[PDB]
TrEMBL record:
Its EC number is 2.7.11.1. The chain holds residues 2 to 397 of 495 of the full protein. One of its GO terms (biological process) is regulation of autophagosome assembly. GO terms for molecular function: ATP binding; identical protein binding; protein serine/threonine kinase activity; protein tyrosine kinase activity. The keyword ATP-binding applies. It comes from Candida glabrata (strain ATCC 2001 / BCRC 20586 / JCM 3761 / NBRC 0622 / NRRL Y-65 / CBS 138). Belongs to the protein kinase superfamily. CK1 Ser/Thr protein kinase family. Casein kinase I subfamily. This is non-specific serine/threonine protein kinase. GO terms for cellular component: cellular bud neck; cellular bud tip; Golgi apparatus; monopolin complex; nucleus; P-body; plasma membrane; preribosome, small subunit precursor. The keyword Kinase applies. Residues 8-272 form the Protein kinase domain.
Length: 358
């Protein structure tokens, strides 16, 4: 039949991950499957790391794992869409408030994972998922297949410094040290997270879309950009905190303990200056709500519908929606940024505008 770990039942694909259901309590879960004849198995390891990290905020709870039939199975918390998904939903650009709120959580998660002697080594928007329903306010971390100890569990002795390492894993968010074949450590997780943030803020990274004849060549093309672009150019249009974060991560030593509190204070102090409340009201939350209230379709016609729904949201919630301007060459001050609140309330179809107010 289709039962896993005594009390669980496989449903439709998601998806080798399937919808699962606890047969005793009726709770929805997720179930990952892996053929026991795989050339390279990942699932058991990922399951054991999940177990080792169990109990950490934002770390999915593994309900069961073991061998079932001719498969390895993993039963775990059912989660929502990825940050990449929500990035796309918001048409590939996040507000400052959203990026700040995300950076704050993601710095906490990474700090926890590091506290359990592990480095993720595949930090990227796809590996952070919000929860389902009411837990949709919490950022979760997944895909620990490439994860790895960075120190002894008992002696906290850091792994030794190595070179000539192939790139793991995704090149867009890989640190500069990873490109140079250096052994990864804690700094590299944080550095990728920095690239995530700039990516979110500005809508892309300047080393996207590159083509090459070979795999190493593309890697080296990306590296050349990561290495030859100034942090000023890279964080143009961003408050100084983003440049500070990146400068900080690039100056960390191989075995150095990151000051996570300092990094968190960067964005927290910034939020206060930009008058943002940590109310877990994300961009997509407000956009979704505004579209819900609109559905004035005949006037929405006179991506165009989204742009207008985005306008109605930026009008309703003027104080929340500040964006980075890519034409900017400088870092904006909090006051320069907040001027967008006034211009947001200045967004001019009167029936649309009235339906907003209603």
């Amino acid at each position: 039949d289709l039962r896993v770990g005594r009390k669980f039942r496989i449903g439709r694909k998601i998806g080798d991950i399937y919808h699962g259901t606890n047969l005793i309590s009726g709770e929805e879960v997720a179930i990952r499957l892996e053929s026991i004849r795989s050339r390279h198995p990942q699932l058991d390891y990922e399951s054991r790391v999940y177990k080792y990290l169990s109990g950490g905020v934002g770390i999915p709870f593994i309900r069961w794992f073991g061998r079932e039939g001719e498969y390895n199975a993993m039963v775990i918390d059912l989660l929502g869409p990825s940050l990449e998904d929500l990035f796309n939903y918001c048409h590939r650009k996040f507000s400052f408030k959203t990026v700040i709120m995300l950076a704050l959580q993601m710095i906490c998660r990474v700090q926890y994972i590091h506290g359990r002697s592990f480095i993720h080594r595949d930090i990227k928007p796809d590996n952070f998922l919000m929860g389902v329903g009411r837990r949709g306010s919490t950022v979760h971390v997944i895909d620990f297949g490439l994860s790895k100890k960075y120190r002894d569990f008992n002696t906290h002795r850091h792994i030794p410094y190595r070179e000539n390492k192939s790139l793991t894993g995704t090149a867009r968010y890989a640190s500069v040290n990873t490109h140079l074949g250096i052994e990864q450590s804690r700094r590299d997780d944080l550095e990728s997270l920095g690239y995530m943030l700039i990516y979110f803020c500005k809508g892309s990274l300047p080393w996207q879309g590159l083509k090459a004849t070979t795999k190493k060549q593309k890697y080296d093309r990306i590296l050349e950009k990561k290495l030859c672009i100034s942090v000023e150019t890279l964080c143009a249009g961003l408050p100084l905190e983003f440049s500070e974060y990146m400068n900080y991560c690039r100056n960390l030593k191989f075995d150095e303990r990151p000051d996570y509190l300092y990094l968190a204070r960067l964005f927290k102090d910034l939020s206060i200056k930009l008058e943002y409340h940590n109310d877990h009201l994300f961009d997509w939350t407000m956009l979704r709500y505004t579209k819900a209230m609109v559905e004035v379709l005949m006037l929405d016609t006179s991506n165009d519908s989204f742009n207008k729904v985005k306008l109605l949201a930026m009008k309703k919630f003027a104080s929340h929606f500040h964006y980075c301007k890519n034409d900017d060459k400088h870092y904006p001050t909090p006051e320069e940024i907040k001027q967008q609140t006034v211009q947001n309330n200045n967004a001019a179809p009167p029936e649309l505008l009235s339906a907003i107010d209603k």
